[PDB]
Homo-oligomer: A and B are copies of this chain.
């Protein structure tokens, strides 16, 4: 089960995922390898890749939803700042990493939690959904 395989099964709902947001064009769900608790992936529903080469308006939409998720994770986990990363070296489907940021070491793929507890993910999901409801009202 490579990361790309699990990722595609989540977006296709063949494997369970912890979603926090969905649009006609964009979904967002918790990663199972979080850099910090609340680490969310913002994902176009269509298969896209190579962020810098994507149509500007399409990328703008993804980054705008990413802003909403960034506000939500800051509110949910009481942080002043949210980190944002685009890498794409593990999964060739565009996805924006958005997470509460506290330490410079939070930005780094080597330090991810490869085995987050189920309650920690449940709580991240519930807190982000609660913050989004506040922000979208």
Contacts and interface: CB of A to CB of B under 8 A. Distances in A.
A90 to B, nearest CB: 7
The number of times this chain is found in the oligomer is: 2
Interface residues of A, number: 36
A101 B85 CA distance: 12
A64 B53 CA distance: 10
Given A59-B63, A104-B108, 11 more contacts: A52-B67, A52-B69, A52-B98, A53-B71, A81-B87, A83-B85, A83-B87, A104-B109, A105-B108, A107-B108, A108-B110
Q: What are the nearest 8 A-B pairs in CB distance?
A: A52-B70, A108-B108, A107-B108, A84-B86, A104-B109, A60-B60, A52-B67, A63-B63
